[PDB]
Design a protein around this ligand. Structure first.
Ligand SMILES: Nc1ncnc2c1ncn2[C@@H]1O[C@H](CSCC[C@H](N)C(=O)O)[C@@H](O)[C@H]1O
Ligand SMILES: Nc1ncnc2c1ncn2[C@@H]1O[C@H](CSCC[C@H](N)C(=O)O)[C@@H](O)[C@H]1O
Lengths: 179, 277, 277, 179
């Protein structure tokens, strides 16, 4: 784990929100600054032509957020596309080995990843997903069976959840409060 | 100083990487091959006498495995091209089916990479076909963070084989020149009393249709023999005479393989970076 | 003085006669092979680079042919044993089916023989199985005017192969002793990572059921490979890797062939009668 | 062909009749002596154990006769058996190449050899058979379509012809004559 910092040292997070913007979400807890037009959040949706240098000049970043599109909606790209692109951009944003600064990342899927895709997701993000009745892969210190989950997914697919806010609570122990 | 090369070969096939390194005289210290085809493993095991450590599926290689089996000086690999080629109508692209296996190479490549402070020499190379959509060629370049070079085996062998080559090997863009002992025409690859119609062969694949009757024997047309296919690709003769494989089985392994003289051209600059015999 | 040997081989098979003569270092001046199996002819043509004059069916060899193709110093041959063995229930004996082909050897042997008063050296040999009825073994001895010698390949190879040998070769009845490079146990004939259950193998024939699973690989039972069959019979490795032949085709040719180390024992005294390399 | 012999030089022929005896038949012209109880004719029927020395020890021979069993008879042995044994014993009876002398041989088939055996018979005896309405293979000087022979063979199969004597006429020009 990362070691906590005195409250007078804490500074506002600068976050990289991929695919799904959480700017309005982060204001509710206060990791973001109400009014800062040059926001600390950098949001991109199409990253097919993003190079490592682009992220470096957009950096530094402390939290890297990636999320699959909401349920139903559209299959603009394969569901695996978001995980692979999230993993590629994450390695660009990680601090160098000569910097032990706090760095966090989170990837959440809204029941869009298939059975085989979960195994790929867990292998690349190096942890099994935990179930919150969405699945979340993240290094945050914060952290029902499949049949009901699958049948529920079938009903909604036949016809933008933001409950992940509760997972951001221990990020208050490393960064500012309503800033 | 110089010490033997430790190689990680993903999607090893019939161990073309180990073959070329030993043909160059490079001392191979460790060769870890990720390979799932039973008949392919039998080839690399018999023809190289157990010098190759097989680890089976690439998706079962953990981060601890790369640390324990490491360090690695060379990471080579060519993902299957079944879902990446314009030939097959039932494609699954770069993200479904076997096309998604490229990211397993990308995953293990970054695991094997030396840290920033470690300035030790580290080389790698990825191979795939040219008949891929521009959207999939771009994405592979976006993940490997470099651009591929196209090297056709027609320049150094007796068959068409245009392939893309990503990597950081020294002098990949250098001009391809054919060596002295390269069988550059089909008649050079044939057996006795057999006459070749053409000078070069249409791109050979796993299927029999790789014209379809390009040889004449006793004044009658006939297909290529397995020994002749091995000569076309630059492999040693009877390299696939293993595990009771028939004509169809041996052509499958050869149809997915690398052109040996092409990989020799690519791996040649490694002689000045590692020990040799 | 000594002159190269001129050989007539009826029912040549995969040219074991030419192979043994060249392995002994004997200068082969002319080798006329009567042979009808396309796959068998392809072997002797490719593996010996056209030094063998094929004349196809033995029943079309006329008396003028023996005069023109002659003179001959050695007449070897082994008629098919399909209708002469106790194995096949539907026998046709020595006088029907393929059994009558022995008389074609008897016919061409007397045609090639030097006339009375010609003291020039002339040798010959006929081979057939031991599992024949006494009525046909007597008749073959009555026509060739001599008695057969029984030589089992078990003494010099890794397999049972008791066969009868008629002929006038020097010292056919001498004790059979194994040479230095003879692989007399199955483990010597196996490939890498392959474990032999038995020391010797049951008599190998044309059918696959020849025990049936005598090798262990990766802790699992497996049959013999084609390369291993060639080592058992004493042929060179990949001697039958010809004409896209599968497992069944190569076992067919090897199952009816001669044990090379046995034929080497029989042809060895010819070194003192003809030219050598 | 051989050259004719003066009549005062001719001597009685000694013949080797195999399978089918022609002693009673050969007397009709008088090649053998009616009083000679041993006779110039040596007849054997079962030759499986006859050796080359046996024929040499029996003395010289001028005519060697072999014939298949008659049609209206069971086949004790395969039809090819008589030809192969006739050919083996014939090479024993031939004079040495150093001492030439008039020598003749005859093989006659009573429609017992099938199509497969005729090709073998002609190849071994080095001549095509001539049809005498029997088939004749011989080196004797001088000497109806199958359609008829095939249908006749079927009628004959449902139910010891000696017309071959007419082929023996020029043999009196080489040996003596009895009356
Ligand atoms: N999941 C997987 N893990 C490891 N190897 C795999 C695999 N899926 C397919 N392969 C390998 O992909 C190989 C073809 S890629 C070609 C192999 C290489 N170019 C050569 O020198 O021959 C196949 O032989 C197969 O064994
Ligand atoms: N009518 C015929 N004329 C010539 N060869 C024949 C024949 N019928 C069968 N054969 C030959 O008989 C061979 C088997 S006899 C064994 C061959 C030999 N002992 C060897 O060294 O292998 C077959 O390969 C076939 O080619």
């Amino acid at each position: 784990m990362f070691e906590t910092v005195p409250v007078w040292r804490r500074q506002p997070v600068r976050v990289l929100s991929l695919f799904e913007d959480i700017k309005k979400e982060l204001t509710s807890l206060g990791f973001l600054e109400s009014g800062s037009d040059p926001g600390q959040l950098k949001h991109v949706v199409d990253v097919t032509d993003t190079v490592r240098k682009d992220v470096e000049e957009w950096g530094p970043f402390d939290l890297v957020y990636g999320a699959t599109p909401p349920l139903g909606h559209t299959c603009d790209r394969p569901p695996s596309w978001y995980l692979f692109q999230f993993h590629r951009l994450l390695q660009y944003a990680r601090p160098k080995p000569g910097s032990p600064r706090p760095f966090f990342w989170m990837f959440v899927d809204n029941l869009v990843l298939n059975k085989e895709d979960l195994d790929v997701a867990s292998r690349f993000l190096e942890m099994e997903p935990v179930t919150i009745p969405v699945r979340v892969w993240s290094n945050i210190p914060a952290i029902v069976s499949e049949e009901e989950l699958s049948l529920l997914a079938q009903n909604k697919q036949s016809s933008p959840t933001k409950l992940v806010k509760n997972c951001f609570l221990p990020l208050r122990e490393y960064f500012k409060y309503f800033s | 100083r110089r010490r033997p090369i430790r190689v990680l070969s993903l999607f090893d096939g019939i161990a073309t990487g180990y073959l070329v390194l030993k043909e160059l005289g490079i001392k191979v210290g460790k060769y870890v091959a990720s390979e799932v085809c039973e008949e392919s493993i039998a080839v690399g095991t018999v023809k190289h006498e157990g010098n190759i450590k097989y680890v089976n599926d690439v998706r079962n290689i953990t981060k601890k495995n790369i640390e324990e089996w490491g360090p690695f000086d060379l990471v080579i690999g060519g993902s299957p091209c079944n879902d990446l080629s314009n030939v097959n109508p039932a494609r699954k692209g770069l993200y479904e089916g076997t096309g998604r296996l490229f990211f397993e190479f990308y995953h293990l490549l970054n695991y094997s990479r030396p840290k920033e402070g470690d300035d030790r020499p580290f080389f790698w190379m990825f191979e795939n076909v040219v008949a891929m959509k521009v959207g999939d060629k771009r994405d592979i370049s976006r993940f490997l963070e470099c651009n591929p070079v196209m090297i056709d085996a027609i320049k150094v062998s007796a068959a068409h084989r245009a392939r893309y080559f990503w990597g950081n090997l020294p002098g990949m863009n250098r001009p391809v020149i054919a060596s002295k002992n390269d069988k550059l025409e089909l008649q050079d690859c044939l057996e006795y009393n057999r006459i070749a119609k053409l000078k070069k062969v249409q791109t050979i694949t796993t299927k029999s249709n790789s014209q379809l009757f390009p040889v004449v024997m006793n004044g009658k047309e006939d297909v290529l023999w397995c020994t002749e296919l091995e000569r076309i690709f630059g492999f040693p003769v009877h390299y696939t005479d293993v595990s009771n494989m028939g004509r169809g089985a041996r052509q499958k392994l050869l149809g997915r393989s690398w052109s040996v003289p092409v990989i020799r051209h690519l791996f040649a600059p490694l002689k000045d970076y590692f020990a040799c015999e």
